[PDB]
Structure formats: C-alpha cells, structure tokens
Amino acid sequence: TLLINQPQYAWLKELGLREENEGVYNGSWGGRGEVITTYCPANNEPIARVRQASVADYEETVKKAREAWKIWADIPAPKRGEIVRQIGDALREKIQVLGSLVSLEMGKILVEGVGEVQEYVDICDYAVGLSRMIGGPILPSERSGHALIEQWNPVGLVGIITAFNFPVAVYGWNNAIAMICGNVCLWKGAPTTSLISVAVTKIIAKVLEDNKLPGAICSLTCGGADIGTAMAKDERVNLLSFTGSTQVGKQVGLMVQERFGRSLLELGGNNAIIAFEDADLSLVVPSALFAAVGTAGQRCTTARRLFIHESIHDEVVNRLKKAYAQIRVGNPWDPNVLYGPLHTKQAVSMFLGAVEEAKKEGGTVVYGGKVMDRPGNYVEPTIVTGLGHDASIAHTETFAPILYVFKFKNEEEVFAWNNEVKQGLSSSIFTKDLGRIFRWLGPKGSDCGIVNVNIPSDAWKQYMRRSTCTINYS
Amino acid sequence: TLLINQPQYAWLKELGLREENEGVYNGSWGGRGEVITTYCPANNEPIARVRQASVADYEETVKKAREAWKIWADIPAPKRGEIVRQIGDALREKIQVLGSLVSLEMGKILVEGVGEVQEYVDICDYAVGLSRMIGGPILPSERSGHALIEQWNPVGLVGIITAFNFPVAVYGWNNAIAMICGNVCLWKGAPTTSLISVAVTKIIAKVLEDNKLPGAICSLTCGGADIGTAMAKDERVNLLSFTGSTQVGKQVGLMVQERFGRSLLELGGNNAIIAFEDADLSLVVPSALFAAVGTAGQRCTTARRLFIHESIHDEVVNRLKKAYAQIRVGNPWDPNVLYGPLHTKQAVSMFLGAVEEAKKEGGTVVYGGKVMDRPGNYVEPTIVTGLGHDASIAHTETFAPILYVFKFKNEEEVFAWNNEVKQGLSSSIFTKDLGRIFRWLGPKGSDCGIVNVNIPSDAWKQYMRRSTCTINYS
Amino acid sequence: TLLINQPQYAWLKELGLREENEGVYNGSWGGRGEVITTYCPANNEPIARVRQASVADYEETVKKAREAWKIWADIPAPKRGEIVRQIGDALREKIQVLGSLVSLEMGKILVEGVGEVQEYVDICDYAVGLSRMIGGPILPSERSGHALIEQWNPVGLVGIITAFNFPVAVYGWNNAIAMICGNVCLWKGAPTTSLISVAVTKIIAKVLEDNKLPGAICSLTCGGADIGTAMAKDERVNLLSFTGSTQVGKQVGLMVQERFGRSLLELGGNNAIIAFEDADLSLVVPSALFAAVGTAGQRCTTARRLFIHESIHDEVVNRLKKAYAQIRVGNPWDPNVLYGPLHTKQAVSMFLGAVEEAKKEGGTVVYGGKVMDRPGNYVEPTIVTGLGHDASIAHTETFAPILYVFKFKNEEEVFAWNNEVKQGLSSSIFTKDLGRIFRWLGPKGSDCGIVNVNIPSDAWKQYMRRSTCTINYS
Amino acid sequence: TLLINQPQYAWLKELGLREENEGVYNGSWGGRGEVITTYCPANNEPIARVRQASVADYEETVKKAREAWKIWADIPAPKRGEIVRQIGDALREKIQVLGSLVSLEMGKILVEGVGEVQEYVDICDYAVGLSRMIGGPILPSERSGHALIEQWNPVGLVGIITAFNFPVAVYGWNNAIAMICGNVCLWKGAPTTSLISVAVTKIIAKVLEDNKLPGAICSLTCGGADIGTAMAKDERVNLLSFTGSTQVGKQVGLMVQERFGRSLLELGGNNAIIAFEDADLSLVVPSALFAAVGTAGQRCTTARRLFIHESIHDEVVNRLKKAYAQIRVGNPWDPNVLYGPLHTKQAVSMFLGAVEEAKKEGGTVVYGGKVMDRPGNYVEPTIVTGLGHDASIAHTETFAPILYVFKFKNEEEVFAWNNEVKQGLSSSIFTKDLGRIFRWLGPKGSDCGIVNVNIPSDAWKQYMRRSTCTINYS
C-alpha cells in the first residue's frame, strides 16, 4: 500500500500531494504519459504515483511556455526578481515538510533535505539583488556620433534537466537565475524524484497564479529518456542546462551542438583528497570522513580517492576506521540519523560489483564492503587500500561510499598521478607548505574547477545572449 | 615563373620569403609535408611555394609548444603583454610590405591590406593594457577564517584555424589575447594564404627569439583539412578557435565536444539590411553599396540581402543601379579602385553559378552578373531583384558581390522573414522611428549578434580556465 | 495632552513608544540631554517626548560603537548580510504601524509613509545579495613570485545625519550598506522626526540583541546641531554621511576635511523641468503637477522651476491651472488626498514669505498662494509666472508646493539659464528630438547628477577603504 | 654662467631648451610673470631661466583651455587614446636626454631619471587600452518602457599641481588618464623643476600641433604660490589634482571644498618597516637600505621608521651600517653613481636641524648625520637609534635620508605604535608568520593605503562625472 495512504505520512498532503499526481504543469496540470511509482529507499515501499508527460504533453507545454515568454520578457528585471523573492518566501513556509519529502523520496538525512531547501531559499534571496545588476556597458565608439552598446537579452526557453542527488537546489539555481534574466523554464527532473519535482512546482505555480502570471513561465514535464532526448533535440529549447552523468551529458552536448543550440553541462567528477607529510590529521580525518560518506557517497563532490603520504598512511587509515565505526545508521528522516540508504536497488548492485572488482584488481577492503541486513538500500561505508593509482575501478564513478586509498612518497608523483585524471571535479589538499599550495593552485597545478586547501557575479550572462549594437545618430 | 623570382617583386624578400618556404615553425623552421604554390588572384600567376606540415611535423610541433608553455606560463602577465607590445612594434616596421603581401596573395585592395595589419597593431596596443587587468576577485567566505578566490589560469595550448578573407587580423586577435593569458598557440591558416601565414610568423618568431623565449609559444603548421582535423581531434589542444564556414565549423564543434575540449567558433552568417519607409535614402544607398561590394563581397559581414519597403523600393533600386555603374574594379595597388579580384578561380565559378541559379529561381539581374574579360579573377558588382524571400540561392552565402533585393510592406512581415533565417550574423536597419529601434534591439527583435542602426572587455576569459579556490587559514 | 496618551493612538505602543522616550541607544537605552516634544503637523498637537543625547551620552556611545566594531568587523560579510536580511523582515512585520508613524510625525500621506518603509525593506533585500559580491581582484604582479591584491576593509565608524523629509529610507540605505561592509553606525536624525528615529532603532536593536550582537553596531544619538557638530569634528567618526541643506553641508564638509576624515554629502539641488516645442503636453502637464506638489513640495527632487517654450507656454499654464484646481489636500490617513500638511509651522511662514517675495520681484500668482484655514500646516499648491529666470526667490529652494514658470524661445537660451545654476540636482526634459536628447545627456549638456527624458553597483566602495597589498612569496 | 651656455651641456638643446624659456603654453608660448632661474643640486650652478605665468597669463590660459575642450570632448575616446599613444612614442624618442634633464635639475640618479620617463611611456601604452573601456552600464529600470543609463562625462578642466620629487610621472599619470577621459589639463609644476615641465610640454605640444589639435588641451602655466592658489580657488577648474605636502594639501582641499569643486589629493606619509623576530634578514637589510636612501630619502614612499624585534635589533643595525658604507656618491647623471644630492640648500638645513633635534630628544646617531664636504647639496645617509616611538622629530616628514630605528618585543605593542600614526602612506612587514600577515592586512591591521609583505581599473572614474539618466520611450 502507498505510504501517502498511511496516516503516519499524512504530512505529505501539506505539499498538495495525493495517491496519484499530475506530472505536467504549463499553467494547467496534466499528464497523459506513463504512470510511475516512486519508492522510499529506506524501506523500498511505494510512496505515491505520478503521471508523466506524453510527447504530446511536451509539445503543448513547449508552445505554452514560448507564449508565456512574450509576457514575461516584457516584465522589468527587478519585478521578475520580486517574483523570485516570493518563491523563496513560499519555500520558507514549507521548508520542514519539503525537506522531509527530500529525505523520504531521495534518501539523504533530514538536516540535508532541509538544508537543500534552505539553499534554494538563499538562492532566491540572492537573485533579488542580482536582478538589479543585469546589463551591459555603453562603450565608446571609434566614430563620432556613434553609440556602441553591449546589449543583453533573454535566450528564451531554458530547458532544465536535473539529477536525483540534488533534486531541489540545482533546479532552484537554474530557475532563479533564468527567471530574473527574463527566460521561461521547462523542468524535467529525475524520474525517481518525481514527487519532489511536483511538490516544488506546486509551490512555484501558486506564486505565479497569485500574481496573475502565466504558469508556463515555470513549466514542468516529468518524464524519462524520451522527454530528455526531446529537449536535447528541440530547436525551441534555446538553452539546455543538464546535470548528470558524464556519458549521458556528452550525448546531450553533442545533440545540442548538432542543432547549434546552447548548453550548460554539469557532469560528474572524481574528487581526490591529498594529505601530505605535514598535514593536520585533526583536519584530514574528519574532512575525509564527511567528504567520503556524506549523503552515502552520492554527492557530485564525494571524495573517492584519498592520496596519503607514506609517513602517515597507516595512522590516517586507522583513524578513519575508528571514525567510520561510529557512524549512525537508520531512517534518514529520523533526526538522530547520520547515514541513510543508497537511492536505488541498482546502486546496491553497483556497490557490490565495485567492491568485488576492486578485490579482483588486488585491493584490500579494510572496512565495510558489505550490504547491511536491513530493509532498504543500505550498504556499509567502505575503505579500500592496496590499489595502484592506475586501477580501472577507482576511476569509475560509482555513486556509493567506497573510498580508494593510495600511498605516495613525494609531491612530484602524487601531482602527476592526479593530473592524469580527466573528469576531475574537485581537489582538496592538506598541507602547511605555502609554496606547495601556490604550485597546486597555479597554472601547473590542479586542473579541477574546485580546489580546496585544508578543507574538503556574472552568473547571469550564462542565461542571456549578447549583441553588439551600433547606433548612428549623427 | 614565380613572381618572387622577378625583379619588381624583390620587396617580398623583406619579409624573409623565398622561392620555396618552410611552412612549419616551432622554434625552428621546417616542413616535410606537401608543397603548395599560392597564386596572385590579380593575374593568376604563381607567387612562391610553401612546404606544409606532415603528420610528424604536427606531432613534433605540438610537443615543442607544450614544453614551451612550461616557461611561458611562468612569465607574469604584464611581461607577456610587453612581448605582445613588441610584436605590435615589429608589425609596424613591416606594415607597408606586409600589407602589400596581403594584397598580393589574398587580393584585397592595398588600403585594406595595410588596414588589416594596422588592426593587428592596434590589437597588440590594446593587449598591453589588458595584460594588467586580467584576474579575479577574492570574495568573502561565509565561514570565518576561510578565503574564497576566483582563480584564472591559462588553458594551455590554443589551436587557431583561420580563413582566407582576413588572413592576418583574426589570427592576430586570437594570438595576442591568448598570449597575454599565458597560453601557447598553434596556427593553421588558409592554405591559399600560406605566404601571409609564414610572413606573420617570421615577424613574431624574431621577437620571441630576440627575447630568448622558445619560438613554439607561437607555432605554425601550414596545411589543409587533414591538419585541421588533427587539431580538432587532439586532446593536447586545450582550446580550438575556428573561423570559417558553418558546415566545417559544425564538424569542428562536434569533434571538440566529443573529447570534452573547448572551442571558439566564428561561423558564417548572412547579413541583411532593412530600409523602412521613413529611412534616409541618402544614407541607405551608399551604405548598401559599400556593405555589399567591399572586399569584392568577401567579408564575413558582407551585405547580401537588402529589404526595402514597397514605397521606396523602385527608387532605391534605381539609385543603386546608378551608383553601381560608378564602381571602379581593378588592381589592388590602384589607389582608385573600390575592390579587386575574387580570391580564387573557383570563386568566379561560384559567382556564375549563383547568378544562373538566381535566374532559374525567377530573379532579375538589374545590374552586373558577368565575369570581366581580363586577367585575374574579376567580376561585376551584381544586383538581383524579384526573388522570393525564401529563395534558396539568396540564403546561400556566396563570397562575391551579389546583392539580393526584396520588397516588403509591414514591419511584422520583414521581421518574420529575417528571423526565419538562423545563421544570421548582422542586421542593419534604416529608420528614424525610435520605438521601432528599441523593438528591434530588444528581447523580441533581431537575434543577430550584431545589430546596427542607420549604419551598415572580458574577452580574455575565453582563453583561460576559472577555478574556485577555498583556503582554510584558521 | 499627548496623542500617545489618547486611546485612538494606542497603536504607537506597538512600536515600543511611550509618553517619554529614550533617544540614545548604544546597546542600552538612555538619554540625559534635553527633552524634545514632537508635533503632528496635521493638527499641531504634541505626540510624545524624547530625551536627547548629552555630551556624556555621545562620548559613551562613540566608545561603545568602536568596541562593538571589534566584534562586527570579524563577522563574514555574507553573515552580516543575513543580519541585514533579518532587519528587512522585522521592518516588514511592522510596516503598517511604522508607516503610520512616518505619516503622523513627518506628515506625508500614508501610501508614502508605508512606501518609505517598503524602500528600506527593498534595500535590505538588495544588500543580502550585495554582501556576497564585495571585494577586489588579485592582479598579476610584473614581478615573478609577487602577488598584488586589491584589499577592501571597513572604514570603522560611520556617522549618519539625516533630514526630516525622508526620515527612514536615507538612514536605511546608509545603514544597510555600511553594515554589510563591516562598519558600525551612529545615527543622528532630524530632531522633529525623533520618534521615527527611536522606532526604527528599536526594530533594529531587537534583531541585533536577538542575534547576541552588541547593539552599538547601530547606535542612535538623537540631538540637534551640537551633536551634528560633534560628529563632524570627531576623529573617531571615520566617515560622515550627511543629507540636508547646502549651507549646512558645506560646513560639515569643511569640518571633516579639516581633520582629514571622509564625508558623503547629499545636499540640496533645485529641479527643473524643460518642455520643448515638440513636447507631448499630455505628458508634460501631469508630470509637472505631480513632481511639483508630491509630498507637499518637500522632496529633495521636487520640481520648482518649469521652463516652457513660447509656443506652448500659455496652453501649458492654462492646463496646469485647471489640473491644480483638482488637487485634493488633507489628512495623511485620507486615501483620497494627493498631499498633506507641511512639516512645521515655520515652513508655512516660509511659504508665505516666498509668495510675497515673488510678487515683489514681479511675479504673478496664477493659482494658489494662500494658507488653508484649517488646523495643521496646510497650504494651497501654488503657481507663479512672470519672474525673470535669474530672480532670486526662484533659486531659493522653499520646501513647499510653489512652482515657478518661465518662458523661453531657443534651446541655447534655456540651456544657458539652467546651467547658470550650480547646485542643480535634477533636470527633466520633454521633447521628441533624439539629437536634442543626446546633446542634453552628453558632455556639453546638463551638469545635473540626475537627468530624465519624458519623465519628471559599486556603491559599497563608498563605505570601505582600499589598500594595495603586495606579497612577496618567492 | 648658465650651464646651458656651456658646450658640455649642449645636449639640453635637444629638448628645445634655451638660456631663457617660455613657461606658459596654451597653444602659444609665452610668460609675462617672474623670471626664475633653476639650479643644478649637484653643483649649485644655474642651468637656465624660465619666464613664469603672470595672473593675466593664467586667466587667458584657462579660457583657452576651456575653448579647446569644446573640440576635444567631441573626439571619441579611442581616438583620444591614440593621441596619448603618440605622446608615449614621442617621450620614447627623447628618453635619454629627458632622463638626463631629470637627473640634472632634480638630482635623482640617471637610472631613476630615465626610469621616470619610462614610467610615463608605460602609462601612455596602458591608457591606449583603457580608452576602450570607458563607460557605464545600461541598468534595468523598475518601470516598463524606461531605460536606465549610467552616463559618464568629462569633468572639463583638470588642474594638475605636482611636486619636485617626481617631476614627470605624476603629471604623466594625471595627464594621460584625464586626456582619454575627454578632459583638458592645466599643469603647474614645482618651480624648482620648471625646465623639466617646459621640456615635457614641448614634447606634448608637438604631438598636438602635428595632429591639428588645439595645444591648450595640455596647457602649462609655470608659477609659484599665487598660481597654485588661483587654481585652488578657480571655479573654472573642475577637478584639481594636487601632489605635495600634507600642510599645503589640506589648504588646497579646503579651498576646493569651499567652492564645491573636486579634488584629488596625494599627500605625504610616514612610511614604516617592521621586521619581526622570524624575518629573513637577507631581505630586510637590503630592503631597508634601498627604501631609506633611494633618491636620497626624497620619495613619498621613503622609509623613515624602522621597527625591529629586540632579538635582531643589534644585528640589523650593524648590517645596515656596513651596507650604508658602500654607497657610491657623485654627480647623479654619471652612470656609476648610486647616491645624489638633496634637491635644495634648504633641504640641507632641514637635515641638519632634524639631526640635532633628534640628538636633543635623546637619539643616538650610529651612522652619518653630517653634511658632505663637496659642492652641491650632499648629506650623509643617517641612522638614528635610541629614540622612543613617540619622539616628535620622528613623526615630522623631513625629506632627507634619516632612518629612525626602534626596538619592540611583541606584535601587540609594535602594531599599536604604528596605528597611532596619522598620515601613514605605506607599511612594510617582514615576517614568515602567515597568521600575523593576515592580521596586518585585515580590518584590524595597518590603516595605510599601501601594505607590503617581505618587500619594501576604474582609475578613469576619478576624472569623470557620473549621471543617472532615465529615458521614457513608452
């Protein structure tokens, strides 16, 4: 029986959810496509159902969004910023129940579900001020009586495809910034977090309707691969923002390039931590633990490779083992719990596969490595030593809490080893040597977009199009 | 026999050119690939020969450039700017002979040849100042004792592929900005402007060598499509800047994306002029003429489509015909010609094909349309009326002076036609209606990247990679 | 008897006001200086009393603020922004009662009282975003191994002196931006709006106190010119922001300069409207009316001089007279009045003096010019014709609704008259001539800081000090 | 007899100088005021004569500059930047002789005279690029159909008053930036460096005249106190840029404030060096020496106070004594010489006075302290120990090479001692403690505008005026 039909989960109805929900919003609610059931990863019970978009629903929604854009693009950016401010206030009023839904459907612990909603609230508050800073300079012409203007305009329709692991705040960032820039949006979220997508859209829809604005400014089309592919191939989708796996992202990027569209791609990464001989182990150990096991290793920034100087390798592994042993496991919406389930059964199979393969490649499991014997998708947070830097399994991004640990002797080799990795998202070094820190942050250092030391505002231009306008008034 | 072996072309030796030239530079000169002879389009006589890159040459050059980068990236940006300043000065000293070579090999009139070199000089002067301005903010962290830094680093090796029609200045822009940003460059120019590529590289190489810097900072590998394809597929080419046809650019874009590289594409676009009922015809007629036939219609920005309101259509066409009859076509060294020969014999065939296709599609040639019976690649400036706005040949960019003229009645009408084309590069409107001007430049107006009215500084970020660095110093 | 002791004014207690109020806040409330009673200008009845700062109070407050700064300056800018966000929310919760107080004590109509508080709320919303944007670049040094940093730090204590006519929002802007910049503030408001100053400070103090921050971050010392002079002469006041009369502002400026302090002066300016021959009169007439009589002519931006081309002068004056006759003047709580009483009885005498001086200088009162025979400080909206452009009384800013009207023939003429005045704050031109518009806004046009056409984000740097830091880490 | 009349100094005539020179330029050369003789500080011989501006000359020159501004302000900023580029090229051609004149008339060593001219050249090269970056944003209005524009215009006439110690490059900075911003300038230099002012103006005048521009764009009025005061009090001087002593600067600032003008003041400072217990003495000692004795202690940034940790105090003083003993003294235009004369006889008297007074206040001269027995104004570079931090003579800025040395025990007291100083221009710390460095650069650290560690681009907005322009086109 559906969780939403059980009295203990009646709080779900505060988000406007029912046993079966419409998964399309374009000013009207609908959905003629496949009906999907989403499940609670803590107990594998079905929560509720969502009727997804058909291709015809998607078509109509794109057309309705483009019609709504005619109205929206004529609203001054500071007034669009006021609408975004009101969305933030509306999220604020629902923060506890929406955060609880994030924990229930996605599986992250409650402080993180609430924290993700709060992040969206903070984004809306930030967007208010940003809405007053949109614009380009009037530059000096080389010709007398000519005005040279850098003009910024909305791209039009921004399609947004998001992933399971941050089912609220990635959409929130894209939506808030795209809205103040005068764009309309179309959201297709992860199918396994459909209820979260519907709940967020219900909150936004009410703000838009209360303001007598066309709802399609923030459209929703829940769906699977066919809807995602339709967006990637659709010339009416002027900008496609995608967050997800590197293999899928590459194909999305190629499809958008094939039609000369625009894309923003946020793809995976291996994240590494490097602890040198002079590191503060009182920072390293808890940093590595939270970076490795936070959200059960399902963050885009999850640490999966830990390089440790030979002199401290054994001690750090030991202290990690101790720390891992204190991790508190349970239902992720229970305020006492520090560690929840993996998001899907399939993730558990990947976890088991990765562990056995690491063994086969010569690795030693020094902690964990097993599925936990309890309902839901719980696995033990795992530490694997003895693998070589090159090990193929250690470069595959398995969204599970497996930490691969490597030893190194000097700065030269460890830097070389890391600079041989491609997708690298973030790099965290722990050292007290200031010169070494400069080398790692500089041109010859990490190639990562995020670099951290002793720790684990033209954003709007990405959602607009620039023109150079020359006016002769002489 | 080669022009360079004739006494009146002895000035070419001031550029370090010979009968047979090396087309590879990486600190040393060489070339084991195929020879290419380039021709003077004013008389169809061979100028001199260039030995192009083989695969081995390309491999060695990429390797030497990446080694040169280890030195270059360590040189402070303002000092890199001083090198670029010295390149500007060296171009200055050669401006007459280098401008004459551009005229000789490419075919543009001397004032434009010299003017293109002057643009590169001005770019160098600009870059000196820009080199003291590159960098990012230290931003306040939300956490006490944490520093948040926006870091900008060179991408590494910047591949630059350029086209025949601006064989100096497009390279110049890419090179100057890439250089001050701490990158090394690899240039593959248009094969038919190989001598120009060699001459520019000899000037730059001397500055680098005099300053005791490895010459491969600004490498050259002359070649055709096989070198271009190598660059697009090469993971060691961190950023590929491509200027040229839309069809080729799409392929380049797809290849670079397939390897998750970075690309900067400057692709074709048609250019339209729109004359509304209230236009100043004494502006419209000369603007249209010069925009349509400048550089024999071979600019990326050449006006090929002219839309005229019904009420002034006949008059504007009559006055254009009268003005066209006064266009003087001839040798690039003649100070009294408006334009010279087309770049290639093939371009002449293209011109004839377009003129015939225009007639087959129902157009009327009201002026020009013929090849001139003289040595070289000279064609008459041509005007075609009567085509429908959607006629295929008028949407084809033919690099020749052919102007297609269309009649319209309403603003809604002409806007729809114009924003029915996709690749559109520039839009020039002639009107006195201020409301109309704002509409055209605003969110619901032209989608071109360039919009002009009554006429026909974060660029460095494109050549660098951004990282967010967080430093815990608490 | 005091209005606050009458039952219908019990709402004032929601603002924490009493019969006798403390006018000093520095973490605690006090006041040993002279008492001041403020009056409601709608009925000339006393509202309540405030005990102002003595010299000892001012000394203690400056000392406590500088001690509070040691704590505040260590709080990260984004966290300071969150405090300012909470101030915005606290103002929101009190917006109706605080707006009513502004109406009661200052005399502006309720929609403007509420609207002024809303502006402070919007400023707080803006500042939240701005707090994440403050900082300077790391710039490339010309020397290897050297880092060049543009550092921004709080100036320290920011003294804020404000005027009667915007007794909330001017303070609000200064305070919000100063706060996110890491400064502490000391407020001295207009004595006749002391209750408003106390009420605003009670709202802010509660946020500070609830957040366990020393209240002297936003200190208040109510007082008259002797407190203002102390602030201007005080070396411990690092930056003095002054809003008010030109004569007083000059003195403040001189005193601050004498001690090499920093000042921000927002001084009087006259505001002119110029209607050219081609002006849309259906814009001109209401624009002039609302600009001239809004807030009973007591805004810094109030239009006091209207220049009309000879060809439309009589017509515009006739239509203004007709429109003026429809202006409804009355109680600030009446939703159907355009403006209410002048702020003081003295302002009424000033109004009468100006009207008489205007006649002595040869002007004709074509409408208004009289005091209304009712309780409170109510005067008729007034129009004066016939004065010469240089007439002394028309260059005097009288904070009352008196509009002086001048006739002109040429553009050169009216421009010369207008740029013969020095203190000019705003210039509003009405015309359809695009060339004229560019001239007026360009280098040879109006010298006003505010220029409007057909209508009547580095600000934070003003509140911080810049340093250039060079770090040799080689 | 005049140096310029002796054959050994005939190189002066390459700068267009004669035995008597016109000291006024406004498009014409003139000067009806007092005739001044300037002297060579290395031998006290007269060089040549300059006829300064009378009050009538000043009046006419102001009027001529304001007339020239009408032309200049209409020239597009990039073309103004081209003029500034040409000035840089003209300085380049004269760099050796102009640098020699700086050494001859001012007294700084030849590498510094040449280096100062090169600085002006570098400024011109920088200004070229800056000229393309002048402008403000078009911001979003809160009202539909309204355009909000941040407009920047020239202030008009910029008066520039400069000092003896950098008689070329301070003017150069002010002139170059003021020119690209569309202003005209009026220069009054130090009377004792009049020949340098005339020589620089001759170079600039030729560029302007070759370009058919009115010479008064860069006017010169050589003169003493009366001309300086006239500029300070002149309402036609829209911006007054002053560089010089704090006492004179304060009065200039007050005079400009009295007339509501604008000023840029660059005033003196005490510069301190602080060497902590862990400092690299191999950096400290040579840093202190060059900072103390460079330009014979006549720089605005000259180190006059050296705080040294008690543990290393004796060693650093000893090593300084050794280093001081190797200083090479002679004629400053002799390429072998490291140390020249003080600029005037009067400076020698100040030097002697300061030394005797330091003795009287209880200080010990451990090196130097005497006038050198040779022609010219040579004094011994001097080190004074034993004074207390509070010592009055050590806070007086005597433009002579006297280094006052203080001992300290811990970070708290030395920071307190330095933060008790007012005019402080720069602060240089030597330490390896990173936390201490952060404290000194942060809000609780140095109040100086320049802070250096282990070592001794909206500039244009200062020369323009901002307006907020609102355009209603609806």
Curated annotation (Swiss-Prot), chains A, B, C, D:
GO biological process: aldehyde metabolic process; choline catabolic process; glycine betaine biosynthetic process from choline; sensory perception of sound
Enzyme class: oxidoreductase
Active-site residues, record numbering mapped to chain: 266 (proton acceptor), 300 (nucleophile)
Annotated (S)-2-amino-6-oxohexanoate binding sites: 301
Pfam families tied to this protein: Aldedh (PF00171)
Site description Transition state stabilizer, residues in chain: 165
Nucleus among keywords: yes
Positions of post-translational N6-acetyllysine modification: 64, 432
Origin superkingdom: Eukaryota
Tissue-specificity statement: Abundant in hepatoma cells and fetal cochlea, ovary, eye, heart, adrenal gland, liver and kidney. Low levels present in adult peripheral blood leukocytes and fetal brain, thymus, spleen, skeletal muscle, lung and tongue.
Signal peptide: none
Mutagenesis / variant outcome for changing residue 169 to V: In EPEO4; loss of alpha-AASA dehydrogenase activity
GO MF annotation list: aldehyde dehydrogenase (NAD+) activity; betaine-aldehyde dehydrogenase (NAD+) activity; identical protein binding; L-aminoadipate-semialdehyde dehydrogenase activity
Binding-site positions, NAD(+): 162-164, 188, 228-229, 244-245, 266-267, 397
GO cellular component, one term: cytosol
Alphabetical list of InterPro entries matching this protein: Ald_DH/histidinol_DH (IPR016161), Ald_DH_C (IPR016163), Ald_DH_CS_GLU (IPR029510), Ald_DH_N (IPR016162), Aldehyde_DH_dom (IPR015590), ALDH7A1-like (IPR044638)
Residues recorded as bearing N6-succinyllysine in the entry: 64
Pathway connected to this protein: Amine and polyamine biosynthesis; betaine biosynthesis via choline pathway; betaine from betaine aldehyde: step 1/1
Function, in words: Multifunctional enzyme mediating important protective effects. Metabolizes betaine aldehyde to betaine, an important cellular osmolyte and methyl donor. Protects cells from oxidative stress by metabolizing a number of lipid peroxidation-derived aldehydes. Involved in lysine catabolism.
Family label: Belongs to the aldehyde dehydrogenase family.
PANTHER family, sorted: ALPHA-AMINOADIPIC SEMIALDEHYDE DEHYDROGENASE
Oligomeric and partner information: Homotetramer.
The protein's name: Alpha-aminoadipic semialdehyde dehydrogenase
Gene: ALDH7A1
